[PDB]
Amino acid sequence: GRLIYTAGGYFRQSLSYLEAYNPSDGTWLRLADLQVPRSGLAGCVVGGLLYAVGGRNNSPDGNTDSSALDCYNPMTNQWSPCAPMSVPRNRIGVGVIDGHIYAVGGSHGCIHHNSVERYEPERDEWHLVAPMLTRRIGVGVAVLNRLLYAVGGFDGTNRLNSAECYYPERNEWRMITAMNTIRSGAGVCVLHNCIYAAGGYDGQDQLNSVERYDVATATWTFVAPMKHRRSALGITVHQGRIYVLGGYDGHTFLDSVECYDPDTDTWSEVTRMTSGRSGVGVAVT
């Protein structure tokens, strides 16, 4: 029995919540709080351990971009600090290839990173890899065919509809087909050999449209939209279905959790988080 972990987020200030949803019995677990509150972070799982990467701590008295890597063990219910990244990355994208964590883009105050770095859990070390062709904050990352895809984001001047691809063996980035929609703060994931980009911000509105990349035909195609417009949403795949958690719709911080069935091309409300929040980090273990 695997669970959907939600870490951090934002509601009036950055949050410390770590909670797990069981899609089988519909229950939520309140787990050990993050040591430092964070929003705009990303979550991932390497060998049964959950990792919270980057983000920023917004508080009513000051804000602090994070370069932290923290590790939660479900067996112990304890967060342990890991080696920090070379630079702070708020609105980060994360991907795992061969049990290695790739920290993609993000911001550090005025800087919009195009730099990418890789964590080796076995050595507790980060090393920079080839940078992206474009600076991307609010970037969606997906691992497909042992390639690391950086999808959309914001380069400090424009919200991007562009997407690029990283070849770990070759240490290089190549531009792929751009999305039909400009999206910064989308939920990006892989389901049945397809990259799905759900929600986001086109620079005007928060989106509810969902589109998928088919590698064979190198084309992005729209699928059923979500019931709620959402940017800074959390996303994961669990038992052949996509789950989208919370987000921001232009005025409200959503508690809404939606599920996509690829077989029926329908979205349905599955549960509500214990409280509305945006900019969460999500993973399944």
Ligand X SMILES: CNC(=O)CCC(=O)N1CCC[C@H]1C(=O)N[C@@H]1COC(=O)c2ccccc2CSC[C@H](C(=O)N(C)C)NC1=O
Q: Which of 8, 9, 40, 88 binds Cl ion (CB under 5 A)?
A: 40
b/e code 144-172 from CB counts within 10 Å (16+ = b):
beebbbbbbbbbeeebbbbbbbbebeeee
Measured distance between the N- and C-terminal CA atoms of the chain, rounded to whole angstroms = 8
Q: Which of 6, 162, 209, 231 binds ligand X (CB under 6 A)?
A: 231
Q: Which of 248, 260, 283, 284 binds ligand X (CB under 6 A)?
A: 248
Q: Which is nearer to Na ion, 22 or 177 (CB)?
A: 177
Minimum distance, C-beta of residue 3 to Cl ion, in the bound complex (Å): 26
Listing DSSP states for 126-189 in one string gives EEEEPPPSS--BS-EEEEETTEEEEEEEE-SS-EEEEEEEEETTTTEEEE-PPPSS--BS-EEE
Q: Which amino acid is at 224?
A: A
Size of the site for ligand X (CB under 6 A): 12
Cα(257)–Cα(14) distance, rounded to whole angstroms?
20
Minimum distance, C-beta of residue 90 to Cl ion, in the bound complex (Å): 6
**Please, are residues 176 and 165 in contact by the beta-carbon 8 Å criterion?**
yes
Q: Which amino acid is at 15?
A: L
Q: Which of 43, 88, 105, 138 binds ligand X (CB under 6 A)?
A: 138
Q: Which of 18, 103, 176, 233 binds Na ion (CB under 5 A)?
A: 176
Minimum distance, C-beta of residue 242 to Na ion, in the bound complex (Å): 20
Q: Which is nearer to ligand X, 121 or 152 (CB)?
A: 152
Minimum distance, C-beta of residue 175 to Cl ion, in the bound complex (Å): 27
* Segment lying near Na ion (by CB under 5 A), choices 56-64, 108-116, 168-176, 236-244: 168-176
Size of the site for Na ion (CB under 5 A): 1
Residues paired with 120 in a beta bridge: 125
Place of tokens 């702070």: 88
Which of Na ion, ligand X, Cl ion, none does residue 231 bind to, with CB < 5 to 8 Å depending on kind? ligand X
Cα(277)–Cα(11) distance, rounded to whole angstroms?
5
Phi-psi domain of 77 (left: phi exceeds 0; alpha: psi -120 through 50; beta: other):
left
Minimum distance, C-beta of residue 182 to ligand X, in the bound complex (Å): 13
The candidate with the shortest Cα–Cα distance to 55, out of 34, 30, 77, is: 34
Residues paired with 138 in a beta bridge: none
Dihedral sign from CA coordinates of 5, 82, 33, 116:
negative
- The residues in 3-22 that bind ligand X, with binding defined as CB under 6 A, are 10
Minimum distance, C-beta of residue 281 to ligand X, in the bound complex (Å): 10
Quick check: 185 binds Cl ion (CB under 5 A)? no
Token reading at 98: 């061969």
Q: Which is nearer to ligand X, 13 or 221 (CB)?
A: 13
* Window 85-114: contact mask with ligand X (x via CB under 6 A): ------x-----------------------
Q: Which is nearer to ligand X, 64 or 180 (CB)?
A: 64
Q: Which of 17, 19, 20, 39 binds ligand X (CB under 6 A)?
A: 39
For Cl ion, the binding residues (CB under 5 A) are: 40
For ligand X, the binding residues (CB under 6 A) are: 10, 39-40, 58, 91, 138, 185, 231-232, 248, 278-279
